[PDB]
């Protein structure tokens, strides 16, 4: 959990502020961010929420695309909003602002729990004292952890490491989704079947994008 740990590059000197206590701490920091403890806490919370939303979005995109390839009438992950509010009972404007109103409470409670740890769990929200208290910096627990397998410290550390690794993987998965949908204009599952159908030919070099073709010779 530190010192002689695997790093982003073997032989590179780890940063002083990256001692390895945080989950997924590979000492990766070319720009020397998160040097201050408050900046480190803000970056950890931002990485955790970006990770959770990225994993949720990538899982939803993969499920919808897999169902669409199986035969279910599901649209592509790109431009799904068009048919979505074409068929939604809730039109645009009302839906996004309703989402913002529903999200504002959770986001400001997260922000003021990050600024003041344990301040939310004081009975202010519907008389909840033991719950709504952040166990860690970016790891609230409580009612967000109904089943208690995070009670064990080693199990909690392993779960944190697994969560941050799958989160970074889902971040790169979403970036890949954007890139090869802009390149191929097809579903990610369609790209996967095209790659596993003719791996020797179908790749990132034969889409007509990414690598430019000028002389064609």
């Amino acid at each position: 959990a530190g010192a002689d740990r695997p790093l982003w590059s073997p032989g590179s000197q780890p940063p002083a502020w990256l001692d390895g206590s945080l989950a997924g701490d590979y000492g990766f920091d070319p720009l020397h961010l998160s040097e201050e403890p408050e900046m480190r806490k803000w970056m950890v919370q931002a990485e955790l929420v970006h990770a959770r939303w990225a994993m949720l979005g990538v899982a939803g995109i993969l499920f919808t695309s897999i169902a669409a390839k199986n035969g279910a009438p599901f649209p592509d992950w790109y431009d799904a909003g068009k048919e979505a509010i074409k068929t939604s009972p809730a039109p645009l404007g009302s839906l996004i602002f309703t989402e913002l109103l529903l999200f504002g409470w959770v986001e400001t409670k997260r922000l003021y729990d990050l600024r003041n740890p344990g301040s939310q769990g004081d009975g202010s929200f519907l008389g909840i004292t033991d719950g709504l208290k952040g166990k860690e910096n970016g790891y609230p627990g409580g009612l967000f952890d109904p089943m208690g397998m995070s009670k064990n410290e080693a199990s909690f550390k392993e779960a944190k490491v697994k969560e941050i690794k799958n989160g970074r993987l889902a971040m790169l998965a979403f970036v890949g989704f954007i890139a090869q949908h802009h390149a191929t204009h097809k579903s990610p599952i369609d790209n996967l079947v095209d790659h596993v159908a003719d791996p020797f030919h179908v790749t990132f070099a034969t889409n007509g994008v990414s690598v430019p073709h000028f002389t064609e010779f």
Binding site: L33, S34, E36
Partner: protein
Amino acid sequence: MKDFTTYLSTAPVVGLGWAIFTSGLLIEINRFFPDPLVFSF
């Protein structure tokens, strides 16, 4: 970080930030409200 932040906390940098903020606000207001002259709600 904190040395770079104090460099960004210097007067020309925050003046530049105010300049871009005010200029962008006025430009977007003029773009989405094309050429107004009299306050008429």
